Nucleic acid binder design. Structure first.
Lengths: 26, 93, 90
DNA sequence: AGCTATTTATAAGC
DNA sequence: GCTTATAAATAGCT
């Protein structure tokens, strides 16, 4: 990551995991 | 420091911003040492009062967060409440 | 400590695991103080050598990471290389 | 941003 | 795990 930005694929997976309540962040 | 400070919001805007900048580096420095000394992967995400984003990752942020999405739950999860209580607890004996 | 330690992988498995447990708390403790003192929101994610996950969030992890997904890029991004250089010089 | 006095965080060790 | 001798971090100033 150039400026430290994460890819859209990673980003969307994080959001899905969290939203779909399938993340360790829940 | 010259004097012990209580852990509560710093009232003076100038001092709050100065403490932020230096303690932020202190935290990243310690995260770096922890990742090297114990061979672990670390990510740190900080949002200041103005919602500005500051981050640190021992390796690469993309890498660490991608890996995080792979876990269903953490082995350990802590929050300010938990840390406060652990501290309040040690205060007695 | 009684002696200054160099910043490199701790060879002894027992000592590495003990230092991990105490420095991990030390880091979270400092994250907590920073969040309260300066009114900021903080999330910490740690994977040990055995890929076990340890986390801390000043408020709620879900909350902080969701918010992170909203940003296109950070205002500041640091890595071990950056910290090492800042330490070497000055 | 550069300077010290204290408060904390710990490396060893039981 | 619980102590103690040292190394770090960092508060109040300039």
């Amino acid at each position: 990551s150039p400026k430290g930005s994460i890819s859209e694929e990673t980003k969307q997976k994080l959001k899905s995991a969290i939203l779909s309540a399938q993340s360790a962040a829940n | 420091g010259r004097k012990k400070i209580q852990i509560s919001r710093i009232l003076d805007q100038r001092n709050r911003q100065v403490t932020f900048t230096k303690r932020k580096f202190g935290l990243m420095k310690k995260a770096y040492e922890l990742s090297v000394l114990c061979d672990c992967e670390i990510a740190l995400i900080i949002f200041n009062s103005a919602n500005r984003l500051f981050q640190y990752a021992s390796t690469d942020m993309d890498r660490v967060l991608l890996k995080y999405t792979e876990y269903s739950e953490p082995h350990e999860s802590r929050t300010n409440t938990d840390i406060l209580e652990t501290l309040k607890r040690r205060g007695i004996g």
